[PDB]
Design a protein around this ligand. Structure first.
Ligand code: FAD
Ligand code: FAD
Ligand code: NFU
Ligand code: NFU
Ligand code: SF4
Ligand code: SF4
Ligand code: SF4
Ligand code: SF4
Ligand code: SF4
Ligand code: SF4
Ligand code: SF4
Ligand code: SF4
Ligand code: FES
Ligand code: FE
Ligand code: FE
Lengths: 282, 240, 392, 240, 282, 392
């Protein structure tokens, strides 16, 4: 079982702008990439996740850095980022689009490009495809129940959530930090994620994540020639701080264990569905 | 190779989509031989003179390699019925080009009664009468999708076309395909790529799931083909 | 004393038939041009369906000019329900229709190129045409959502709006299209004026002459007030063809004051730009000159457009179940008419369409008469016919 | 014989329709043995007592002859999955009762997200998981069609149930069935019986042909079943 | 093959009320039965066709005797008579409904009654099923072409269309009578009638038609026990004038020749559809 | 010191669970009645769908009371768009709701008959229930279109007018139903008053007591003015059950002024007919008496009904996309609430439903406390619980 798919280099990195770091989940790689492209004419639009005061997510095309800043942080709830990909190249008029999405949404983008039936003049305009790691998603009302009725903190007063370290973590604006075992957070997950076998967004230009890298830092896979040229251009400009993933802890060994834990667990779900007669992607 | 564009009960939009390869249409036409296309070439002209009349017919030539059949078949018109069986007889590979030929498309709503042929009421995809080898959905399929099918057919890329060769055996499409085969089957994760593929904008992402405005759906099949939890061949995981 | 039948005619859209009665010298004495394309029957299946489905469905009349029917459909539903589209939506709508006419006319010049363009100039001529069409299709892509079947054309105006960036792009694309149009027009006008094909055969001076009037309501868009739709009466094929030919025709026979009328570029150029030439060559010339008129009006709409102005009306789609709304639009082929009556629930209770080529088919039948039958098809193509359109 | 009413993700309306045999429901219940029905009988009670808990469970009994399975299967609820396989295990004849069990019906529109089980978003007809022997479409099937099915099952009228035993293999239904299989196939003659059968009044006869108001269709299957150009076994031609 | 199906007797007959004969097509059998049943409580509602001043038909639940008179006569155009059968027993509240229809619409009625899935509380309320003979139907705009363009009579000036004798006959309100070879009418007929194998309405309680009997009279098949009781009740009440089909000409030999002609012609179409792969009822 | 779990509970609609904490003598100390029925999720898939689809869809909450959800839906959409149904349509709608309650109450008396009706009287008792139900379902067939899921219940009123024939048939059947109601009522009220089951078991005098108030807006139909919906708050099952029990509950927990409330026949009979008895037998008694109230109001409506009066409002379904329409209806089980927000195009933008038994479920949890657990199921059935309704 391969753990990461194809990639050129694995890196632990972080954004150089302090504004980004104050607003980002981990190392601010997505926001850093989007803002750099926009500011340097590499991109003219980017798909982002806008969040309502109560953490509801709405897809949006972005043409201003402020917009990118207005939407930095992880909402552990389903946001259809690819639903706006055509709108981006039509009315918005983008020709150098940036797209972000969980590994699945990246899979949708790659198929969307190879068989562009309903995507006339879309594929050529995709200028950078950023993938974020993902283990499991949740319906909004499911995450609402965990945070509010299992963790005490009310959604509005939530400021940052994070899974790992053995369980779920909700960080309150006011200052408290609550944790509940990850074993109780299972009943409320999107069950269509139990057939997903991509952890590190193996088909993105650039994949970025939290695990394997310390707090405030992001594990960054560089996969495609396009992602490499973009990633390098940022480094030569000083938009990123870069350390080898070997020199950093916990390191790639953690990504590998979480990735192959997802794959081995969900591959057994796939075989269970096949066994009882339910459809599985092929 | 020899290719021909058969126009049944369509609107020529699929042909225009191919024409929207723009200046690359010369590279496509220069890579094959356009042997028949009523919209483009005067083929195959055959003059039959009796003592009463001169009949100048443009007929479908024999030994066609790839037939791009566009439109549906009208069961009550004999010339339509005849052209579809001729396309299969004379062509080695029949491509159901466009939703009309592949799944019926807009013509599924036909119920006839209009002048000046009020008995014209029954339109079927070409798969309901002849064997189809490849099917391109959408209304119309994108110029980029067409180029890939043409390039894959010239180059014998069997793997790429497998998804379309599998579609040829499917003669019915709807926006309900997403419900019946994805949402109802605990496979939808809410990317929204389906909503972007629709040419009539009939799909609307609501709470991370597709909602199909069924009265705007023209049964084109672009969303069913797009959704990556239906078909996802290993071929797609290939990038550099 | 013989019958010449050409079937199907070629290098136009769709499926027709020429049935000619010629004398011994080949001169057409009685002409008949008729559609034999099956009747998909849009005016009859739309009844019972919601109004917003009309511009989606009628757009499938034809893939060359889909915008013209979408435009005419919503204008007819807006008229039936007393809906007024906002200024900037009406400007984008017109821009979308002009973008469509910006690819149709070069496309037609490409179809007729085997007859008029020398073979050595073919590749460059096709390249220039396709460069023009790419700009035209991009305008329909940006404004309409799709080039072929534009889903933004809605009852109320235009669904989406464009960014100043996009507007600025189209304005620059239009200036380059205007360059290509001058190149194209400086090349073809001499050929059309010579009246000789590329193989050397000279065309008769009176080629395609006829005695009928014209119908055009606007130079670039459409104006329902310039026509008295009560004087428009549709007759049957039995009223223009011989009985054995009439049963084959799929189209109706539209008349204004009980007379055939020609529509199309020359119809518009006659009414608005004092163009008075008759025949088939004048038809190719007016179409070629109209390319400059379109692109100029496109840049004139962009200079007038407010990219942040409202595009969709907030009025609801409610009719009284009686008013026969009128929706006219100057398609690339000519005066295009849709009519629809809508009930209180926004549903279609009657629908009818009189497409441009529907007007010209019976005019073409007469225009081929008087000249040899080997020139008949050249008279047909001068009318840029679209048959799946004329049949709907 | 032993019959049982299994209630999955349904509305009980199918059971109420059987109750709408009125006083003849006692002639039905006396010709068979109602061995299980949570709505009606306290079966099959099994008491397990530990030192901390008394577990009074009503389980589906063994040796069921005919199982009237009503409602669809929720793929994310484990008790729903367990009960549908339990019904196939313990029943000789499995009847997909109602459109929900037969073709999904109204639950085809479910897309989850509602409290207090927001992961419940995938509903399938029982045919997508177990083997179905007979299927009754409609929402609900009329009491008369039920009486006829039960009588034919008890009397071994295999000929009468053939059309229903054929439906058991069909897990999808829609008003489009009339278009795809009749109107588009030059079979529709304009009776209008398909319009009279529709429980939601979604079919409207316009100019001698049906028009489906697709947003008012619950995918029940009654119209597709009634149409005489689809199925017309000779059995119908018998009159006295 | 068999030509008429099951019947008890076959008799030439016509109504006794001559108001009926003023308005009917042939013998006035349908209206006579409806009006008799209504007047004598055997029927409380009857499905009839309300034609339009341009002969556009409309199905209708009639309850009053005079209504029955406004639907008398043949409109050789499709009329969905069965489409109102439920509305007849719901809001209209009928319990002794009479239904009329071509053999195909009677077939639908018999299936409607045997598999009443969508027809709750309907079968038991059908009191009389009257079938009318039928050879071929037409779309309205098809018949409009036959009458207006081949017979030169405006649908408005149309009075009584009829077929037979080898041609279609249009009788004008103003006196003229036109005839065109049936050959000309065949291109306009609804192509779904070419799979119909029922000429004499073989599944109706009572079937009545024009062929076989003389002008002003009607061939009447009495088939079921229900139809026999209704028919006998009318003859003892004097509502019908009755003569044996053997003493009347052309007689049962014409119906037979026409019934089998249809069967052999269309059975070929059925076998042609099977051959090329189209669906055919079974 | 023991837990008692009954699962599933029987002779009510749907799928529930009893989870009781009982002392060493079997007396319930902490009660838990909860739905485990899967959540089909109507309020969430209706968003995005047209308004006229609501009464069709929400009718499928349940086949026993579908008329109550169709009525509440159209009332909520009419409230959201300021549509006023015509006088005679509102009468037919109320009649359709009353005919539906005329089948439910006898049905429930049939469900509980194995506990209360002697085995020798069973057949004749059931025959009388089914004779009554037939009449109630006939009223729903005639007026509503179908007895199970009435499609005539529409936004704007009722789709179809009946005939004077149909009206008179119903009035005569209502006179016969009233005769059956007296026979039934005179037979059951003495049984319910005895507090002894059919096997001789005496039920505790305080069986099913509780401390909560009632909600009832009308005796036979509904009145949105008689409740302040702002004071109605839905809470989560964690706020009433233990955590290991809460995660299994499928319903929400409605409260009025932060308190649980009982709905249903006794709730109605307390407000409108000064019925003050507590406990579970009072519920069976109130439900039995309401049968006479219903059929007597049905004949009062028929007397008032104008068979030829308009039944559908001509107003269009157009909302402002903000107003939260309120639709209440006294279902057979009690106050049934639906809410809807409608946009300008007639599409649902938000939908919510607080069904009757959704109210009664957390009340049953408390009502079973204090008495032995062998009586818990008899307390449940006194509330005629419909669970597929309470879950939707
Ligand atoms: C449901 C979910 C589960 C995840 N699980 C894991 C995990 O198990 N392990 C792990 O290492 N990482 C996981 N991630 C990713 C992780 O939480 C961070 O988003 C990422 O690792 C670092 O982001 P960043 O700081 O580099 O960029 P940032 O500057 O923080 O910006 C984050 C970007 O992500 C986008 N985004 C936010 N929410 C969503 C969403 N729901 N869907 C799509 N796009 C979104 C926003 O548009 C934003 O631009 C998950 C993310 C999601 C949404
Ligand atoms: C399309 C068509 C084709 C026919 N072909 C033949 C034929 O080939 N040979 C033959 O012998 N008879 C044929 N008939 C029947 C014949 O024309 C007479 O209708 C028949 O004799 C019964 O008329 P009557 O005088 O007995 O009844 P009347 O008292 O005249 O009443 C006639 C009844 O016919 C009903 N009706 C009229 N039009 C329709 C319609 N479109 N659909 C359903 N019901 C309708 C009216 O509601 C009315 O109740 C045909 C009828 C139709 C509609
Ligand atoms: N131009 C054009 Fe169409 Ni294809 C034609 N003819 C019209 O409205
Ligand atoms: N009565 C009732 Fe339903 Ni089946 C419940 N509980 C509601 O509106
Ligand atoms: S686990 Fe897979 S399917 Fe689920 S949200 Fe993450 S990437 Fe998508
Ligand atoms: S698929 Fe669409 S574009 Fe192609 S022929 Fe059919 S209607 Fe025209
Ligand atoms: S929903 Fe859209 S993409 Fe899918 S079949 Fe319908 S029209 Fe085509
Ligand atoms: S493309 Fe497939 S997985 Fe993505 S939102 Fe649409 S149906 Fe769901
Ligand atoms: S088929 Fe209809 S009546 Fe039967 S359970 Fe499903 S929703 Fe209820
Ligand atoms: S059209 Fe009516 S009868 Fe047919 S499937 Fe839909 S709801 Fe059922
Ligand atoms: S039941 Fe069948 S034949 Fe009759 S109208 Fe409906 S689809 Fe046509
Ligand atoms: S020929 Fe048959 S299918 Fe056609 S109208 Fe007559 S009875 Fe019906
Ligand atoms: S199949 Fe019927 S609307 Fe989709
Ligand atoms: Fe027309
Ligand atoms: Fe709720």
């Amino acid at each position: 079982m391969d753990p990461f798919g194809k990639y050129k280099t694995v890196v632990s990195a972080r954004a150089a702008d302090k504004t980004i770091l104050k607003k980002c989940q981990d190392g601010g790689i997505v926001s850093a990439a989007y803002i750099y492209g926009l500011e340097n004419g590499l991109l003219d639009g980017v798909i982002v996740a806008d969040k309502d005061d109560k953490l509801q997510t709405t897809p949006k095309v972005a043409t201003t850095v402020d917009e990118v800043l207005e939407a930095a942080g992880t909402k552990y709830t389903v946001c259809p980022t690819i639903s706006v990909i055509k709108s981006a190249v039509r009315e918005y008029g983008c020709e150098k689009l940036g797209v972000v999405g969980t590994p699945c949404q990246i899979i949708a983008t790659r198929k969307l490009m190879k068989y562009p039936i309903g995507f006339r003049h879309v594929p050529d305009k995709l200028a950078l495809i950023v993938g974020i790691f993902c283990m499991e998603n949740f319906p909004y009302n499911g995450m609402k129940t965990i945070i509010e009725e299992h963790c005490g903190i009310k959604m509005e007063d939530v400021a940052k959530t994070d899974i790992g370290k053995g369980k779920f973590w909700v960080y309150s604006k006011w200052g408290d930090v609550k944790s509940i075992k990850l074993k109780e957070t299972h009943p409320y997950e999107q069950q269509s994620c139990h057939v997903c076998m991509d952890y590190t967004a193996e088909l993105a230009d650039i994949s970025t994540g939290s695990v394997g890298s310390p707090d405030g830092w992001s594990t960054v896979f560089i996969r495609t020639a396009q992602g490499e040229e973009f990633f390098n251009k940022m480094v030569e400009a000083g938009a990123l701080e870069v350390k080898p993933i070997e020199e950093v802890k916990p390191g790639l060994g953690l990504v590998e264990k979480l990735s192959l834990t997802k794959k081995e667990k969900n591959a057994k779900e796939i075989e269970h569905r096949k066994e009882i007669g339910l459809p599985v992607p092929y | 190779v020899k290719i021909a564009h058969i126009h049944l009960c369509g609107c020529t939009g699929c042909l225009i989509s191919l024409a929207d390869t723009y200046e690359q249409l010369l590279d496509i036409l220069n890579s094959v031989e356009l042997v028949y296309a009523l919209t483009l070439v005067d083929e195959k002209t055959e003059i039959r003179e009796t003592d009463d009349k001169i009949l100048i017919e443009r007929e479908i030539p024999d030994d066609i390699d790839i037939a791009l059949v566009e439109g549906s078949v009208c069961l009550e018109d004999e010339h339509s019925m005849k052209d579809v069986f001729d396309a299969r007889r004379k062509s080695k590979i029949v491509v159901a080009l466009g939703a009309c030929a592949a799944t019926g498309g807009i013509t599924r709503f036909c119920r006839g009664g209009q002048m000046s042929k009020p008995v014209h009421s029954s339109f079927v995809p070409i798969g309901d009468l002849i064997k189809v080898d490849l099917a391109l959905p959408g209304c119309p399929p994108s110029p980029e999708a067409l180029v890939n099918l043409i390039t894959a057919a010239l180059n014998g890329d069997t793997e790429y076309l497998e998804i379309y060769a599998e579609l040829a055996k499917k003669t019915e499409a709807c926006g309900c395909d997403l419900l019946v085969n994805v949402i109802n089957k605990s496979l939808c994760m809410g990317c929204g790529s389906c909503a972007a593929s629709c040419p009539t904008r009939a799909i609307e992402m609501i709470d991370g799931k597709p909602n199909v405005l069924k009265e705007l759906c023209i049964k084109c099949g672009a969303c069913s083909l797009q959704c990556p939890r239906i078909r996802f061949p290993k071929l797609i995981e290939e990038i550099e | 004393g013989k019958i010449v039948e050409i079937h199907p005619t070629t290098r136009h859209e769709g499926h027709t038939k020429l049935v000619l009665k010629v004398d011994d010298e080949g001169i057409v004495e009685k002409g008949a041009y008729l559609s034999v394309t099956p009747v998909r029957g849009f005016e009859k299946f739309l009844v019972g369906k919601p109004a917003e489905f009309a511009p989606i469905a009628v757009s499938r009349f034809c893939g060359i000019c889909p915008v013209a029917h979408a435009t005419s459909a919503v204008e007819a539903i807006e008229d039936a329900c007393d809906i007024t589209p906002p200024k900037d939506g009406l400007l984008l709508r017109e821009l979308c229709g002009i973008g469509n006419k910006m690819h149709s006319h070069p496309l037609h010049q490409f179809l007729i190129s085997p007859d008029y363009v020398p073979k050595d100039d073919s590749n460059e001529f096709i390249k220039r045409v396709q460069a023009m069409r790419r700009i035209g299709q991009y305008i329909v892509d940006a404004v309409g959502g799709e080039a072929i079947h534009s889903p933004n054309i809605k009852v109320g105006g235009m669904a989406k709006q464009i960014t100043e960036s996009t507007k600025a792009k189209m304005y620059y694309k239009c200036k380059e299209y205007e360059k290509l149009a001058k190149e194209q027009l400086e090349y073809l006008i001499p050929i059309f004026e010579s009246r000789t094909l590329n193989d050397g055969t000279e065309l008769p001076e009176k080629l395609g002459y006829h005695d009928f009037g014209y119908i055009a309501t606007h130079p670039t868009y459409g104006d329902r007030t310039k026509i008295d739709q009560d004087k428009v009466v549709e007759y049957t094929p039995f009223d223009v063809y011989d009985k054995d030919v009439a049963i084959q025709s799929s189209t109706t026979v539209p008349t204004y004051n009980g007379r055939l009328m020609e529509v199309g570029p020359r119809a518009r150029f006659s009414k608005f730009f004092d163009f008075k030439e008759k025949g088939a060559m004048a038809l190719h010339i007016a179409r070629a000159y109209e390319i400059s008129v379109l692109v100029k009006r496109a840049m004139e709409i962009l200079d007038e457009l407010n990219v942040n102005g409202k595009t969709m009306s907030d009025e609801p789609i409610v009719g009284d179940g009686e008013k026969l709304g009128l929706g006219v639009h100057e398609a690339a082929r000519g005066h295009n008419t849709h009519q629809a009556v809508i009930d209180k629930d926004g549903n279609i209770v009657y629908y009818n369409a009189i497409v441009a080529t529907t007007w010209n088919i019976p005019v073409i039948s007469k225009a081929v008469e008087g000249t040899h039958y080997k020139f008949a098809e050249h008279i047909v193509r001068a009318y840029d016919p679209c048959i799946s359109c004329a049949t709907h």
